[PDB]
Structures are given as C-alpha cells and as structure tokens.
C-alpha cells in the first residue's frame, strides 16, 4: 500500500521538514506507507506555487501538505477547491470557509481578545505584521468599537530592514504622544525578536510596560533578554511541554543528530514545526480510517494536466476530505479535532506570563469556556493586616 | 485558466479585472511570462511589473480631504474588497496626525439578515457620538449604507 | 550588567575612570538615556593622530 502525497516546504523550513520526517518515522505502519514528494519553492511566489501544485497533481497525489503566504493562499484554496484536492497546512487559518483545506493552526483571535479583557485594557498599541493577514487586526478593531477601546494600530511590517532604526525611534515617538505603556506584538517569531531587541535598547522594557506576544509560540522566542527588565510580558503557548506526550517527544527530539535533522537538537520546538508533526499523524489516521471503512480511492499518476478544461474533479477526493476532517487524535498541540470546513475545534491554548523564574502558565483558553485561570495565585500579599482594639466611648 | 487560455491563443496584451483574491495570480503570471496586463481595477499594493493600472491612487486625495475639514475623530467603514491599502493609510496617518479612527469592517455583513447588524453598527458609533463617517466601499455597498 | 538590570536609563550618570573612553563599546549604553562621561588621551582630531 503506497500512498503518494505532496509536500510544499518553503525554503528555510528546516525544523518544519525535520519534524515532518520524524512524523513519517513515528507514524509508519506495515498496513501502508506514505510517499512524500518534496518541493522546495518560494511560498510567496504565487506562480511557483501554482506549478508545484499542478506538478504534484500530475504525479497523481491523494493529498498535499504545505504552506502558503498572504499572497499565495488564494491560489491554494482555489485550486484545491476546484480539483477536490485536500490540502493540509500548519499556516495561518483561512479567512472564511474554504473546502478541501485542513488547518493545523487554531484561531488565536479568540484567545487574544479574552486576554485583553482579563488585564482590563482600554487603551493599547497594536503593532501588527501583514504577513499572516489582517484577520486579527480587524478582530481587535471591530471589538474596539463594542468594548470601546482606543487602539493605536501600526503596521510594523513594511519597515525596510537595511536602515530600520530611524523608523523604530519614530515609532515609539508616536507611542509616547499618548504615553502608550501597553503594546501588543502581532508578529512572527523573527519580527518579534527584532522589536524586543529595540525595546531593550530604548529601555522601554522596564517596570510600567506590558507586552503581549500575539502568537502560538510564546516560548519559541528568546525571552531571557526582556525577562529581568521589569516590564510584564504575556503570550500564548500551544505546545504544552508539561504533557507526558510532548515531554516524551522532546526526550527523543533533543537527542536527534542536528546534522541529519537541522535545528532539531533543542529542548523546545516552534509551534509551526509541532503542527507539521501533528499533521503527519492526522494524514495517517485519515488514510487508515479509509482502509478500515472499505473505501477504494486508489488511482495512478495520470490525473492529467490541472489546467484541463473542462476541469473534472475526481470523486475519490470527496472521501479523502471526509476522512481527514473526521480524524480525532492526541498530538503535541493538544486535542486535535475538526469541523466540516477544516478549522480546528475543541482545542486548548495556554495563557502564559513571564515571571522572574521564567515563563509560567496562568490558565488556558477554550473555544467554549473562554479564559479559565489555573492555580498560581501567590496568595497572599502581606494581607496580615493590623488588629486595632478600641472601646465604645463618645 | 482564462490567462493561460488567452496566452496559448498567442495574445500581445491582456485587458481585464482582478479581485483582492485573484490579483496575486495576475501580477505573478504577467511578471513571469512578461505579458502586459491593463486593468481599471484597484492599484496593486507594491511595484508589480507588466501591469498597467487605469485607476489612480485615491489614498492621497482622501488623507488631504480629512485635513481640509480638520477631522480628529471619525468613523471609517471599510470594505475588504479593494484591499486594506487605504485602511492602512488612514491608520498609519492616525498615529502621526493623531486621529481617533473607529475602523469597522462593513464587508463581512451577511446580506440575508443584514439589519440587526446595522442597528448594532450605529450603536457603537453612538458610544462616542460619531457624527463624521468615511464610507470606503463600492458603488453598491454605499447605496445600502446610505439607505 | 547595567543595561540588563536597566540602570542605564535617564537619571543615572556614569564616569569611566580611564584614559580610554572611546576604547570600549559605548553603542550599547549610548541610547539608554543615562549620561556617560570619561577621559580620552588619544585625540583623534589631531592631524598627527589622524
Ligand atoms: C472534546 O475535547 C476533550 C478534550 O480533549 C475530549 O476529552 C472530549 O472527548 C471531546 N469531546 C467530544 C464529544 O469529542
């Protein structure tokens, strides 16, 4: 049983591919083997993505795992919908209901808005990056109307990096007109470190400031720098290293040879990579539920040209979708479940705060229970008041 | 398909339209295949070669008009159809010129029950007693709002 | 260490008691805010040194 699948990995996704390989090994069975056809292309380039898709389609694949950018996302969602091809991706969730797309990344929009109310914020700065779509930006802006917030949104993305200093100085110059002390960083693991470094340089990392890293990888970045500064830093973590499941994964991951497995000799793992590993498990359980369900879907490498007109969708694809979307297993990113569209449901996102001793989970966020705080209260706080005795005498 | 079809037919230039979703496809192919693409649609957010845009950039004219009326606090109802290029414009300028902009995506409003949404829309535009609104929409979405 | 604990912001004043003020890296505590003074024996403004 040889199931051929496509793999679209953006140049530079070393740890992601390394995690993709480890998944192939951990979830390899005798019942059937997955044959990944890897294609390293510039994910941003829409044209290239189109070729890589039609190429993997002519090779006759049953499913495709890859990534997309804010620019190429429309290409994938469109083709996969027309050709009834299933596309599994750890990338940011699609802004809508696009069929034949499985998204490993849970929606953070909800967890973010809940955290803001927890700290009871009414006026804050929102530094965003247009890389993962303004889906979360619209979220905070729309909620700013209802909850009545004074949000200062600033696109920290289009900043040219070969002279990006007179821009940051002019950035926190506007964030001083209103004396902004509460900032939300909605950026990638990289753009965050750049900002964090600048923050320390200008000294805006001392007590009084409060930063919120708007990503699923709070511990993915270096925090040792703004850890002793004084400013409170909060964020979100999807990979709970306290789970015996994840703890066991790291035990083998941290030992792997960094030569064969690039950027894999660490005690931690980027949430993007962790989702890639969980993606393999989903594809395995999906193709397995098709064998046990007595469903024939097999074909050959003659699907033909994807530009074929009229384009006829192979009916066997409809079943492959109902398989992946029906999958429900336990992975590094907590309980994995899907709806009819492909968006993850019944998941859990741990809310993190950065203390002196390091990061610490102060609670979690459920799509049905909102935010729920867990034990951690430093009870008490010198509450030991003073007992004053007195007599009733006018 | 329509692009590759017209390309196989051996054309010298292509005139058409694109959406916020298909725009990347056109700009990419036309750049790779060195095919010229003339379009009246919204200008591309960047410098994409082999693309001729008939529509001038309104971003500039809008910002200038705001200062003319001397606006400091206004509501900005936008539609994600023509890209948030102008939205980013007013938001970025809101930092410099110090404006209190209330941006609201009036696009994702489902039209088969779009009434309890408008009532809840001007309910938020009443918390701050917004009297100055900017409608960044198509000729159609504008009439709906105006009505 | 000063930068780490954040004692390099406005309000602090350091004096480097050596003849090599520009000999060390100052780009780090340069934008901090705290005033830093010192001593220089090698004048790079002299045509001789230049
Ligand atoms: C929802 O998720 C929880 C936590 O993983 C799980 O225990 C439960 O079975 C799920 N609910 C259903 C009905 O699938």
Report how far residue A365's alpha carbon sits from residue A298's, in angstroms, rounded to the nearest whole number.
Answer: 41
For the CA of A334, the nearest atom of ligand 1 = 5
Q: What residue has token string 């600033």?
A: A154
Beta strand pairing call for A86-89 and A101-103: parallel
Given a contact cutoff of 8 angstroms between Cβ atoms, the answer to whether A91 and A64 are in contact is no
- Which of A204-235 are b and which e, b meaning 16 or more Cβ less than 10 Å from the residue's Cβ? bbbeebbbbbbbbbbbbbebeebbebebbbbb
Within 13 A of A237's CA, how many CA atoms are on the CB side? 25
Q: What residue has token string 């051996």?
A: B10
Given a contact cutoff of 8 angstroms between Cβ atoms, the answer to whether A238 and A216 are in contact is yes
Nearest residue (by CA) to ligand 1, atom 4, is A335
Given a contact cutoff of 8 angstroms between Cβ atoms, the answer to whether A122 and A96 are in contact is no
Tokens of A255: 């030992």
Helix, strand, or coil here: A379? coil
Beta strand pairing call for A232-237 and A330-331: unpaired
For residue A123, give the H/E element and its range: strand A123-128
Q: Does C30 touch chain A (CB under 8 A)?
A: no
Helix, strand, or coil here: C33? strand
Report how far residue A364's alpha carbon sits from residue A257's, in angstroms, rounded to the nearest whole number.
Answer: 34
Report how far residue A46's alpha carbon sits from residue B103's, in angstroms, rounded to the nearest whole number.
Answer: 30
Angle between helices A46-58 and A73-82 (to 10 degrees): 30
What's CA A214's distance to the chain center, in Å? 10
Would the CA dihedral through A164, A168, A169, A171 be positive or negative?
positive
Query: Does residue A313 have a cis bond before it (omega within 30 degrees)?
Result: no
* Residue among A275, A251, A276 at smallest CA distance from A265: A251
Report how far residue A45's alpha carbon sits from residue B3's, in angstroms, rounded to the nearest whole number.
Answer: 17
Q: What residue has token string 């496809």?
A: B25
Q: Which chains touch B (3 or more CB pairs under 8 A)?
A: A
Between the CA of A125 and the centroid of ligand 1 the distance, in Å, is 36
- Mutation probe of ligand 1 site: the residue of A327, A334, A345, A346 with most atoms within 8 A of C-beta: A346
* Residue among A371, A352, A370, A349 at smallest CA distance from A362: A352
Supply angle C-alpha B57, B62, B63, rounded to 5. 110
Between the CA of B10 and the centroid of ligand 1 the distance, in Å, is 57
Given a contact cutoff of 8 angstroms between Cβ atoms, the answer to whether A175 and A125 are in contact is yes
Query: Does residue A310 have a cis bond before it (omega within 30 degrees)?
Result: yes
Nearest residue (by CA) to ligand 1, atom 12, is A346
Closest-CA residue of chain A to B23: A71
Would the CA dihedral through A332, A333, A337, A339 be positive or negative?
negative
Between the CA of B85 and the centroid of ligand 1 the distance, in Å, is 42
Within 13 A of A63's CA, how many CA atoms are on the CB side? 28
C-alpha separations of A308 from A99, A315, B14, B121 in Å: 21, 16, 21, 46
C-alpha separations of A341 from A26, A96, B20, B58, B144 in Å: 28, 9, 22, 37, 30
Radius of gyration of chain B measured on its C-alpha atoms: 19
* Residue among B92, B3, B83 at smallest CA distance from B46: B83
Output DSSP code: residue A184: E
Tokens of A179: 């004396």
Contacts of B26 in chain A (CB under 8 A): none
C-alpha separations of A252 from A16, A28, A43, A270, A335 in Å: 16, 16, 30, 16, 21
Across the interface, whether the CB atoms of C9 and A201 are under 8 A apart is answered no
| B contact residues 61-80, partner A, Cβ 8 Å cutoff | 80
* DSSP calls for A343-359: -B-S-EEEEEEE-SS-E
Across the interface, whether the CB atoms of A203 and C8 are under 8 A apart is answered yes
Nearest residue (by CA) to ligand 1, atom 13, is A346
Helix, strand, or coil here: A211? strand
- Which of B92-115 are b and which e, b meaning 16 or more Cβ less than 10 Å from the residue's Cβ? bbbbeeebebbbbbbeebeeeeee
Tokens of A15: 């740890």
Question: Judging by beta carbons within 10 Å of its beta carbon (0-12, 13-18, 19+), is residue B19 exposed, middle or buried?
Answer: middle
Report how far residue A369's alpha carbon sits from residue A311's, in angstroms, rounded to the nearest whole number.
Answer: 44
Report how far residue C7's alpha carbon sits from residue A133's, in angstroms, rounded to the nearest whole number.
Answer: 39
Alpha-helix runs per DSSP H in chain A: 14-26, 46-58, 73-82, 109-118, 135-146, 171-174, 189-202, 244-253, 271-291, 316-324
Across the interface, whether the CB atoms of A203 and C4 are under 8 A apart is answered no
For residue A89, give the H/E element and its range: strand A86-89
Q: Which site among A138, A140, A169, A312 would you substitute to test the B interface, given the most B Cβ atoms closer than 10 Å to its Cβ?
A: A138
List A352's β-bridge partners, or say none.
Answer: A235, A361
For residue A102, give the H/E element and its range: strand A101-103
For residue B89, give the H/E element and its range: helix B85-96
* DSSP calls for B20-78: TTTHHHHHHHHHHTT-EEEE-SPPPSS--SSEEE-SPP-HHHHHHHHHHTT-SEEEEEE
- Mutation probe of ligand 1 site: the residue of A329, A333, A335 with most atoms within 8 A of C-beta: A335
Contacts of B59 (CB under 8 A, 6+ apart): B85, B86, B89
Q: Does A50 touch chain B (CB under 8 A)?
A: yes
Contacts of B96 (CB under 8 A, 6+ apart): A174
In chain C, how long is the greatest CA-to-CA distance? 41
Output DSSP code: residue A284: H
Contacts of A237 (CB under 8 A, 6+ apart): A216, A217, A218, A219, A349, A350, A352, A359, A361
Radius of gyration of chain A measured on its C-alpha atoms: 24
Given a contact cutoff of 8 angstroms between Cβ atoms, the answer to whether A167 and A179 are in contact is no
Beta strand pairing call for B51-53 and B73-78: unpaired
List A155's β-bridge partners, or say none.
Answer: A128
Q: Is it the case that chain A and chain B have 3 or more CB pairs lying under 8 Å apart?
A: yes
Q: What residue has token string 């994938």?
A: A76
Given a contact cutoff of 8 angstroms between Cβ atoms, the answer to whether C28 and C6 are in contact is no
Report how far residue A197's alpha carbon sits from residue A233's, in angstroms, rounded to the nearest whole number.
Answer: 14
Resolution in A: 6.4
For residue C3, give the H/E element and its range: helix C2-5
How many other C-beta atoms lie within 10 A of the C-beta of residue B75?
A: 21
Report how far residue A288's alpha carbon sits from residue A281's, in angstroms, rounded to the nearest whole number.
Answer: 10
Q: What residue has token string 């105006």?
A: B146
Dihedral, C37, C43, C45, C48 alpha carbons, nearest 10? 180
Would the CA dihedral through B28, B33, B34, B38 be positive or negative?
negative
Tokens of B107: 């696009």
Helix, strand, or coil here: A279? helix
Which residue in A201, A202, A228 is closest to C5 by CB distance? A228
For residue A7, give the H/E element and its range: strand A2-10
Q: Does A284 touch chain B (CB under 8 A)?
A: no
Across the interface, whether the CB atoms of C31 and A229 are under 8 A apart is answered no
Dihedral, A64, A65, A70, A76 alpha carbons, nearest 10? 10
| Angstroms from C27 CA to nearest CA on chain A | 10
Beta strand pairing call for C13-16 and C35-38: parallel
Radius of gyration of chain C measured on its C-alpha atoms: 13
Report how far residue B5's alpha carbon sits from residue C9's, in angstroms, rounded to the nearest whole number.
Answer: 64
Angle between helices A109-118 and A135-146 (to 10 degrees): 40
Report how far residue B43's alpha carbon sits from residue A76's, in angstroms, rounded to the nearest whole number.
Answer: 23
Report how far residue A66's alpha carbon sits from residue C8's, in angstroms, rounded to the nearest whole number.
Answer: 46
Q: Does A348 touch chain B (CB under 8 A)?
A: no
Given a contact cutoff of 8 angstroms between Cβ atoms, the answer to whether A50 and A78 are in contact is no
Contacts of B124 in chain A (CB under 8 A): 145-146
User: What residues does ligand 1 touch, defined as CB less than 6 Å away?
Assistant: A 335, 346
C-alpha separations of C48 from C20, C21, C43 in Å: 18, 19, 9
Nearest residue (by CA) to ligand 1, atom 11, is A346
Q: What residue has token string 């938001």?
A: B91
Nearest residue (by CA) to ligand 1, atom 5, is A335
Angle between helices A14-26 and A271-291 (to 10 degrees): 30
Given a contact cutoff of 8 angstroms between Cβ atoms, the answer to whether A354 and A231 are in contact is no
Report how far residue A18's alpha carbon sits from residue A277's, in angstroms, rounded to the nearest whole number.
Answer: 9
Would the CA dihedral through A135, A140, A144, A146 be positive or negative?
positive
Given a contact cutoff of 8 angstroms between Cβ atoms, the answer to whether A214 and A112 are in contact is yes
Supply angle C-alpha A257, A263, A265, rounded to 5. 45
């Amino acid at each position: 049983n040889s199931i051929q699948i496509g793999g679209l990995f953006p140049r530079g996704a070393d740890q992601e591919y390394s995690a993709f390989r480890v998944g192939m090994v951990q979830f390899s069975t005798s019942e059937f083997r997955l044959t990944p056809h890897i294609d390293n292309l510039e994910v941003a380039n829409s044209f290239a993505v189109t070729n890589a898709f039609c190429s993997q389609f002519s090779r006759g694949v049953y499913a495709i795992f890859g990534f997309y950018d804010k620019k190429s996302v429309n290409t994938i969602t469109s083709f996969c919908g027309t050709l009834h091809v299933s596309f599994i991706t750890p990338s940011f969730p699609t802004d809508g209901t696009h069929p034949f797309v499985i998204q490993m990344r849970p929606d953070l929009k909800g967890a973010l808005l809940s955290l803001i109310e927890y700290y009871q914020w009414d006026k804050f700065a929102y530094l965003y990056d247009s890389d993962r779509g303004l889906s979360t930006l619209q979220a905070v802006l729309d909620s700013a109307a209802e909850k009545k917030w004074q949000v200062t949104a600033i696109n920290v993305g289009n900043i040219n990096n070969d002279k990006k200093d007179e821009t940051y100085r002019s950035l926190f110059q506007d964030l001083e007109l209103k004396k902004e002390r509460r900032v939300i960083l909605d950026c990638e693991r990289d753009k965050v470190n750049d900002i964090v470094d600048q923050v320390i340089t200008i000294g805006k990392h001392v007590k009084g400031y409060h930063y919120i890293i708007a990503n699923l990888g709070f511990t993915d970045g270096d925090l040792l720098k703004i850890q002793f500064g004084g400013a409170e830093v909060s964020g979100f973590q999807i990979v709970d290293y306290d789970d015996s499941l994840v703890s066991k994964f790291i035990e083998r991951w941290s030992t792997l040879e960094e030569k064969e497995y690039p950027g894999a000799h660490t005690a931690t793992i980027k949430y993007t990579s962790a989702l890639t590993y969980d993606a393999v498990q989903v594809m395995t359980e999906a193709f397995r539920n098709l064998r046990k369900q007595r469903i024939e879907i097999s074909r050959r490498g003659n699907a033909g040209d994807c530009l074929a007109n009229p384009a006829v969708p192979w009916g066997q694809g409809v079943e492959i979708e109902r398989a992946l979307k029906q999958v429900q297993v336990e992975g590094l990113s907590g309980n994995i479940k899907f709806d009819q569209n492909g968006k993850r449901i019944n998941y859990t996102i741990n809310i993190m705060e950065l203390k002196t001793n390091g990061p610490r989970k102060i609670g979690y966020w459920s799509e049905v229970d909102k935010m729920v705080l867990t034990e951690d209260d430093t009870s008490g706080l010198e509450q030991k008041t003073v007992v004053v005795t007195t007599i009733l005498e006018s």
